[PDB]
Amino acid sequence: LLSQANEAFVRNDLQVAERLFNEVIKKDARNFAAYETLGDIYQLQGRLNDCCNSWFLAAHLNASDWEFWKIVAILSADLDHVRQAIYCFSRVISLNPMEWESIYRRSMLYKKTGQLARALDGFQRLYMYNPYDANILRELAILYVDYDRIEDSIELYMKVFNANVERREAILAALENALDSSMFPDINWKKIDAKYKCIPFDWSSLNILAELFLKLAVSEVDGIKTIKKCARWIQRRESQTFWDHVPDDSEFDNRRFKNSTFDSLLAAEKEKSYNIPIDIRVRLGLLRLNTDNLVEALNHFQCLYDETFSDVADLYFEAATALTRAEKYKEAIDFFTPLLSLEEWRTTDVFKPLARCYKEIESYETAKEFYELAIKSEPDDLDIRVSLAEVYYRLNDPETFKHMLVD
């Protein structure tokens, strides 16, 4: 008689029908289809949560419809209750270990909740399933950094690199043979694209590496030697091994024409990109400035001068502030000073260090001017005081006692 009570109800749609549909199974508890009916209605009336708790129960009657949990999990993630969402996802995954979507989604709700041990052990898995997804690669590289392992995040991009070298050698030996047998060569790609596949290494990759060598802040000379080996492989210059054995950091500069072995190179090779993109070059500057080589770091930063200024202002600033932190003051002022011309940069952010730089070179006259401008926008004490110390050193005490108390 139960089956009749439910049947009459399920057939047709009215707001009284579906709750009375619950009332019969209210006598005795469990019907899987009962809930799937419930959710269908709650979803339509447009109130989200009741829809979730109905289905969220349904999924327990049949533990085995995992396409179903995945829906209940993405809905608990949509309604912003996470602990359910990760739990539902974890059933989808105990049923199906290879479900990619749910391992990923779950493992990034793991990230938001800040269980990294789980979220890492999570993206690692997807990266095992498919090594060639670039999104997964980044997401994994990132967690490694947040998890305070930079060293692992670097090896990760290094393999991608080598994988690209192995593959280029394959294609080069491939058509070195194709001409012997044989009117052009025909290389068989289906065999190549299957045999060596790893993700393309382009400048973006090398930049992502560069930033990883900064965050490490260790053995910074090894980082530089490598940024150069890779940047050199790109631009098909890997042929020239010698650059590995000189300190100058001299390639990627005109300095390379004073080179003994370079001169002897034929014209074909002499013409090839010896230049590197700016976001990376400013990163070699920083990376050198870490080793307190200001002479080399400077030659990199000086390259900002050849880029259209409005395009990279933020780099001028980052360099200037990097010199300020590295306590090289005479030079910082040179990468601060241009930001002044563009209106949006005139702020305490630029004005404080500019001044402090001047105060530090023992020219206090001009340093006054900036702390003043800086004090205007922002009412802060820390850098009003340092303005006293400036009115102190250039003006000696006579008629400086009034100013001090005034401020």
Numbering used by the authors: 131 to 312, 337 to 561
Sentences from the paper on this structure:
Recruitment of Pol III to these genes requires the essential transcription factors TFIIIB and TFIIIC2.
Starting from a construct expressing residues 1–580 of τ131, we identified a stable fragment by limited proteolysis and mass spectrometry corresponding to residues 123–566. We were able to collect diffraction data up to 3.15 Å (P62) and 3.4 Å (P43) resolution. The structure reveals the presence of 10 TPR repeats, while only nine TPR repeats had been predicted. Rather than forming an extended super-helix, the TPR array is instead separated into two ‘arms' by a central region that contains an extended helix and a disordered coil we call ‘ring' domain. This insertion causes a bend in the TPR array, positioning the TPRs of the right arm closer to the TPRs of the left arm. Despite crystal contacts in these regions, the accommodation of the TPR array in these arrangements in two different crystal forms suggests that the conformational changes are indeed permitted within the TPR array.
